[PDB]
Structure 1
Amino acid sequence: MDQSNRYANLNLKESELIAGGRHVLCAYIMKPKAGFGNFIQTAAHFAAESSTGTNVEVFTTDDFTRGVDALVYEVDEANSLMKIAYPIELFDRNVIDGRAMIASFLTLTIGNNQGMGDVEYAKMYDFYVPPAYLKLFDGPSTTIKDLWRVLGRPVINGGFIVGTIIKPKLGLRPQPFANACYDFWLGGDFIKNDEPQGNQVFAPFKDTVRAVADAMRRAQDKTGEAKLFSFNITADDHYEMLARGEFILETFADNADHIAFLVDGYVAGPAAVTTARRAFPKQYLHYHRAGHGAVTSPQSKRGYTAFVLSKMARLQGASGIHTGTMGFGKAEGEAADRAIAYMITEDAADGPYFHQEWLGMNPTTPIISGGMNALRMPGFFDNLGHSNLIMTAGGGAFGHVDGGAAGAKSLRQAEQCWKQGADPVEFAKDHREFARAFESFPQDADKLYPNWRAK
């Protein structure tokens, strides 16, 4: 069935659709499967399955329904581009508070359209949210300002937060775990749970939370500096997430504002993210995206990009989200991913297809992680342009030859080097912990700074 006359209107102007403020706009890279309809026919069926229709005519359709159809307004077949306009009335709203839900956005814009038999593939690269819909999202309640304030840093451009992940990923019992925390905190600021750490039989949650709280008090007494921890509170059960969060805040007591809550938002879903955002709005919500690579990888021609994932996370209310190392670490990622960081931190920014005004919605911190170490950091910051962020180096800190404290100091020193505009090899001559990161990761040192041993 050809539904192009109903679901396609290529005479609509994007600038008028934006100015109108009545439509969500999505841009997709799509390819029709061979043997079905042409590009516009396939894009029109895609619009129908993403708004008001199905694959056949139904006699219950009225003119009111036709008015809320999603419309294909722009195509570019040689570049596989399809842009659709979604009337904002289509999106579901809470009965309890009239607010928006990202689950409805996902259901319509990247839901059943991902299982179409006549489409080879379709992936969302950008979306535009107008003011009338944007303002109905939670947005972040806590930001990096609240971490800077706890550290005694300026709340405007407070700078780089030196972090790590406790490694091994799993296996440390409660006291060995808190001993590694204490060691890192002698030189660093922030520690996060590795994403799966929680209530394993060999490291029960309550025993680890108590041991970590004791290690925070001892490290603050020893250094005279505030320390931060991001606990994993992810669970299927909403009530388990509440039980974990409430226990941590009570246990940390006068250090309760030093606590961030980590949620595995991609695998547990938006429902888990919203549970922590709404139950604990005064605690920094750390969005961990484990599993995202199944769709965001450039190897995938389906689902949505990491740029789209990150933009949605700001609307959901993440205080920070992992944006990757932009090609400087161990994971998939490119230098151009710096545009993701600007979209989640600025009040106005450009996406690959759509500019976005955030109307004062709070920023989401880019959390940098994945095979980072002291040696790889100057190149990373040169590409991004600032260090007003959190960087967590698990292997980079606990793989440092002189220990966790020296590991932490090598990361502190690497950002000082970049901030001072110094040559890393020349800088290392007067900074031992940074110099010893060359001997800890010699394969990286040989690649990045060829004659480092002679100097």
Structure 2
Amino acid sequence: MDQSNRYANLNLKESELIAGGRHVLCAYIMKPKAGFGNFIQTAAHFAAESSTGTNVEVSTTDDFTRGVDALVYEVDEANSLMKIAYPIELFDRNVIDGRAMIASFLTLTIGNNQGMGDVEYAKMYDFYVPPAYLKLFDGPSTTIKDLWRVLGRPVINGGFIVGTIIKPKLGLRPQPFANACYDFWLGGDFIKNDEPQGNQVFAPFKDTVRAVADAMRRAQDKTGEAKLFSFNITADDHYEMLARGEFILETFADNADHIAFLVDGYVAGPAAVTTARRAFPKQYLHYHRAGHGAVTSPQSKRGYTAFVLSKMARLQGASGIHTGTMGFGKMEGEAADRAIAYMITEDAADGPYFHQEWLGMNPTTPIISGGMNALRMPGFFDNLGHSNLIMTAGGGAFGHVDGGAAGAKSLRQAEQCWKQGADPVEFAKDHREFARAFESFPQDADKLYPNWR
């Protein structure tokens, strides 16, 4: 049967649904499966499976039920575009405090509709959230401002945070791990656990934390500068996340405001992210997205995009989220991905389909990571347009020919070169650690700065 008379109204105007402030709007690229309905019928069925219906009429439906139906308001068969309007009354709210949950938004807008037999694929590209719904989300409580304050930087346009990931990914016992943190910190600001580091049997959590705290104190005393760490506290069990966070804050003591908490939020879920957001609102929430590629990749025609994810992460409370290297590194990415960063940092931004007012909600930091080194940084900043961010480089730092300290210094210098408007090879005559990144990575050097020899 077909349900477009009830779940489609193409005579509605997007400008009026927005000005009315009663509807979440979602934009999808969808294709029906050969053998069922035409585009409108398939789209109307989609809206029903995502709102108030199923595949047949049921005797229990009443007039109040119809009032909250999600409607298909705009379609473009030749570009595969479908747009749906969801009344805000559909979304779940906490009993304890009346706030919104991201899990409800996902369950409706991108849940069972992803397994419909009469649809070949559908992927969400953009969404709009009006004021009355927007205000019920947590938003971030800690920002890069709080990291700038701890480093001694100005709290407005404090600049580039030079960082690394401890490599190898797994395998370092507590003291070697701690020794490699010391070395980087002699030249850099910030260090994160690689996403799987935690409580492996060859590197127990408590011994590793304790050896890193010792290394932070020794690095601060030697250099006279503040240092930062991002610990992974990801777990299935909510009380294991708490236990880990509490041990860290207590162990670091007077360096407790130098600590960020990392959460693998795509594989652990919103629940893990909200555990850390609500239990530790004063510690920088670092959101790591490992596994996201299964859906976000342009090779995928299902799910949602990295843009959508990032937009959601901000509403959830992430202090920073990995946004990718925008084609500049080792992972899949595009230069057009610069728009992702601007949606998460500004108070008004444009998406592929929707303009979004954030109403003063705190910004989320773009965390640039993924096969970056000193040589690839200039090109990257040129495309994005600023350096008010954290950038982590593991192989780029520990793979430097002269070690982790020098690797750290080459990343600083590379941003000073860009900031100044200087030519890389020429700049590399006054700055040795940067010059040696050319011999560290001669394959990259030959590509970007050909005749450097």
Give yes or no for TM over 0.5.
yes
> Partners in 1 of 2:276 and 2:419 — Cα distance?
35
> Partners in 1 of 2:305 and 2:238 — Cα distance?
28
1:424 Cα deviation from its structure 2 partner: 0.5
> Partners in 2 of 1:110 and 1:4 — Cα distance?
20
1:371 Cα deviation from its structure 2 partner: 0.4
Match of 2:225 in 1: 225
The C-alpha deviation readout for 1:337-390, integer Å capped at 9, x for no partner, is 000000000000000000000000000000000000000000000000000000
The C-alpha deviation readout for 1:147-202, integer Å capped at 9, x for no partner, is 00000000000000000000000000000001000000000000000000000000
Secondary structure of 1:140's aligned partner = coil
> Partners in 2 of 1:18 and 1:427 — Cα distance?
51
> Partners in 2 of 1:84 and 1:279 — Cα distance?
35
> Partners in 2 of 1:66 and 1:439 — Cα distance?
68
> Partners in 2 of 1:51 and 1:442 — Cα distance?
56
The C-alpha deviation readout for 1:305-361, integer Å capped at 9, x for no partner, is 000000000000000000000000000000000000000000000000000000000
The C-alpha deviation readout for 1:110-141, integer Å capped at 9, x for no partner, is 00000000000000000000000000000000
> Partners in 1 of 2:303 and 2:44 — Cα distance?
18
Secondary structure of 2:375's aligned partner = coil
Match of 2:418 in 1: 418
Match of 1:119 in 2: 119
Match of 2:209 in 1: 209
> Partners in 1 of 2:62 and 2:438 — Cα distance?
70
The C-alpha deviation readout for 1:194-222, integer Å capped at 9, x for no partner, is 00000000000000000000000000000
The C-alpha deviation readout for 1:251-298, integer Å capped at 9, x for no partner, is 000000000000000000000000000000000000000000000000
TM (norm. structure 2) is 1.00
The C-alpha deviation readout for 1:430-454, integer Å capped at 9, x for no partner, is 100000101001100011000011x
> Partners in 2 of 1:352 and 1:198 — Cα distance?
38
- Number of equivalent positions: 453
> Partners in 2 of 1:407 and 1:91 — Cα distance?
49
TM (norm. structure 1) is 0.99
> Partners in 2 of 1:63 and 1:422 — Cα distance?
68
* Superposed counterparts of 1:378-397, under 5 Å: 378-397=378-397
RMSD between aligned residues: 0.3
Give 4+ residue runs of structure 1 displaced > 3 Å after superposition: none
Secondary structure of 1:79's aligned partner = coil
The C-alpha deviation readout for 1:29-76, integer Å capped at 9, x for no partner, is 000001110001000000000010001111111010100000000000
> Partners in 1 of 2:392 and 2:85 — Cα distance?
39
> Partners in 1 of 2:45 and 2:394 — Cα distance?
47
1:410 Cα deviation from its structure 2 partner: 0.4
1:239 Cα deviation from its structure 2 partner: 0.2
Match of 1:400 in 2: 400
Secondary structure of 1:48's aligned partner = helix
1:245 Cα deviation from its structure 2 partner: 0.2
Identity of aligned residues (%): 100
Secondary structure of 2:78's aligned partner = helix
Long gaps (5+) in structure 2: none
> Partners in 1 of 2:109 and 2:153 — Cα distance?
41
1:95 Cα deviation from its structure 2 partner: 0.3
Secondary structure of 2:452's aligned partner = coil
The C-alpha deviation readout for 1:17-38, integer Å capped at 9, x for no partner, is 0000000000000000011100
1:229 Cα deviation from its structure 2 partner: 0.1
Secondary structure of 1:330's aligned partner = coil
1:228 Cα deviation from its structure 2 partner: 0.2
Match of 2:282 in 1: 282
> Partners in 1 of 2:58 and 2:157 — Cα distance?
57
* Superposed counterparts of 1:161-176, under 5 Å: 161-176=161-176
> Partners in 2 of 1:395 and 1:45 — Cα distance?
49
Secondary structure of 1:126's aligned partner = strand
Match of 2:179 in 1: 179
1:11 Cα deviation from its structure 2 partner: 0.4
Match of 2:430 in 1: 430
Secondary structure of 1:210's aligned partner = helix
Secondary structure of 2:298's aligned partner = coil
